[PDB]
């Protein structure tokens, strides 16, 4: 998503459903490639030690001064009628500059944003409807005009404008936890394996304390640890080396 071709609008975003994988969130904060890296509620270093059920990456492009409006508890036209954030938003909002990638010569006016709607949208709800509602008491009933405002408007993405109007690729990371088992977790940082020493061990399946040494036991390929007659961890299999 960071190296994608081109993002969509702020109301018709391509929600990439992330599942059945692992992702290091602490390496993205120190990657020195993002212009804005600020999470809300949950630290990105704590995301590697926590699992989530479904992860949604809402990718859209806004202007330079609109990065403060993509936050829980803020106002704005894009925050109410385009991308509604909940009051308990525990995700993360990242951004980086894309003025030399998404802009065009003379101005990229393909990105749209909704100005108004009949009602406020739900949090994490995508609406691609283009219904036109009148402003005054006289409806236009189709073709706009005579006090009939168009709900959309073209974004102005020029290569020579100020920093507040440059295109900025913003990917909002949505996190949730339900009764379903989790699919997205963080990668456990591995260390060197030391044998023939009274030290601790912490594998992917079970941890404990004891000296690990080679023997003649052979485990099944779908097992990671074992128990004796007294129900005590007496033998373990290394996850990296078989």
């Amino acid at each position, epitope marked *: 998503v960071f190296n994608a071709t081109r993002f969509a609008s702020v109301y018709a975003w391509n929600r990439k459903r992330i599942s059945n994988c692992v992702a290091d969130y602490s390496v993205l904060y120190n990657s020195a490639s993002f212009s804005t890296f600020k999470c809300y509620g949950v630290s990105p270093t704590k995301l590697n030690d926590l699992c989530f059920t479904n992860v949604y990456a809402d990718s859209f492009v806004i*202007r330079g*001064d*609109e990065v403060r409006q993509i936050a829980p508890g803020q106002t704005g*036209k894009i925050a109410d009628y385009n991308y509604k954030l909940p009051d308990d938003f525990t995700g993360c909002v990242i951004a980086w500059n894309s003025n030399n990638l998404d802009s*065009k*010569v*003379g*101005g990229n*006016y393909n990105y749209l944003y909704r*100005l*108004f709607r009949k009602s406020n949208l739900k949090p994490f709800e995508r609406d691609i409807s283009t219904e036109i*509602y009148q*402003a*005054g008491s006289t409806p*236009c009933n*189709g*073709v*706009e*005009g*005579f*006090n*009939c*405002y*168009f*709900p*959309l*408007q*073209s*974004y*102005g*993405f*020029q290569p020579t*404008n*100020g920093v*507040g*109007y440059q295109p900025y690729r913003v990917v909002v990371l949505s996190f949730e936890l339900l009764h379903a088992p989790a699919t997205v977790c963080g990668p456990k940082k591995s260390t060197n394996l030391v044998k023939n020493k009274c030290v601790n061990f912490n594998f992917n399946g079970l941890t404990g304390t004891g000296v690990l040494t080679e023997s003649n036991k052979k485990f099944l390929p779908f097992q990671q640890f074992g128990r004796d007659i007294a129900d005590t961890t007496d033998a373990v299999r290394d996850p990296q080396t078989l």
Partner: antibody
Framework: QVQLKQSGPSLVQPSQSLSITCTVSGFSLTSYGVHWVRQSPGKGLEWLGVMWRGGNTDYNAAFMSRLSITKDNSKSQVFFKMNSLQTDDTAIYYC???????????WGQGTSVTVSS | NIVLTQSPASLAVSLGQRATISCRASESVDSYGNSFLHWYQQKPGQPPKLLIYLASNLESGVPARFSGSGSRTDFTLTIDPVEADDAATYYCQQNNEDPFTFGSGTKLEIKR
């Protein structure tokens, strides 16, 4: 990316008819409405009318009975048909790109229209 | 007919200060959540351009020095700070009621 130039009128006689052609290029004409104004006809900025998005037409109070707007979606050009031209219609006409809440965001170059006996 | 009384006719604001241009409207109000108008800036040797729509958002092509607010009837344009490229006339356009005409024109002059 926004081309709203005008050409065609050079010198018009009074009590005649001539249509001003504003060539629309660079963007979709069927998604916006071309406006029409004048540049300093004695007073400051004056507004004439607004072409809808392929529908009806709206005009000013002093410019409805004599002026008419014709939108051609095939040739990507918006015509401004003028009827009963007098000496008071000597101004520089402009075409504008429609915004979201009926705004005039982008502008064109236009041409100089001079009507005199 | 909507008579957009624009006051004053001229101003003398130096560099680094804030200019105040008023605009009075009557009809109409209460579009969807606001009742504001549009602002424009017309140079004597250049076609005009849109500065800020509905007095609460931003518009590309112009710097972010143009802002403002107002009530349902009176409107205020805020030019802060005034640079060396603001010596032009200003207008306000009605958007809630036909005719969608402009104002009289406030000729802003840079006090040098």
């Amino acid at each position: 990316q926004v081309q709203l130039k005008q050409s065609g009128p050079s010198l018009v006689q009074p009590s005649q008819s001539l249509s001003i052609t504003c060539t629309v290029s660079g963007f979709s004409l069927t998604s916006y409405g071309v406006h029409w104004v004048r540049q300093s006809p004695g007073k400051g900025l004056e507004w004439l009318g607004v072409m809808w998005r392929g529908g009806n037409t709206d005009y000013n109070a002093a410019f409805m009975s004599r002026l008419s707007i014709t939108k051609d979606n095939s040739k990507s050009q918006v015509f401004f048909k003028m009827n009963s031209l007098q000496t008071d219609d000597t101004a520089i006409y402009y075409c504008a790109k429609n915004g979201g809440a009926h705004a005039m965001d982008f502008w064109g170059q236009g041409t100089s229209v001079t009507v005199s006996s | 007919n909507i008579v957009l009384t624009q006051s004053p006719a001229s101003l003398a604001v130096s560099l680094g200060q804030r200019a105040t241009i008023s605009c009075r409207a009557s009809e109409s109000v209460d579009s969807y959540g606001n009742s504001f108008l549009h602002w424009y800036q017309q140079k004597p040797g250049q076609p005009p351009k849109l500065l800020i729509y509905l007095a609460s958002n931003l518009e590309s092509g112009v710097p972010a020095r143009f802002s403002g607010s107002g009530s349902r009837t009176d409107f205020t344009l805020t030019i802060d700070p005034v640079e060396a490229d603001d010596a032009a006339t200003y207008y306000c356009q009605q958007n809630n009621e036909d005719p969608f005409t402009f104002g009289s024109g406030t000729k802003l002059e840079i006090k040098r």
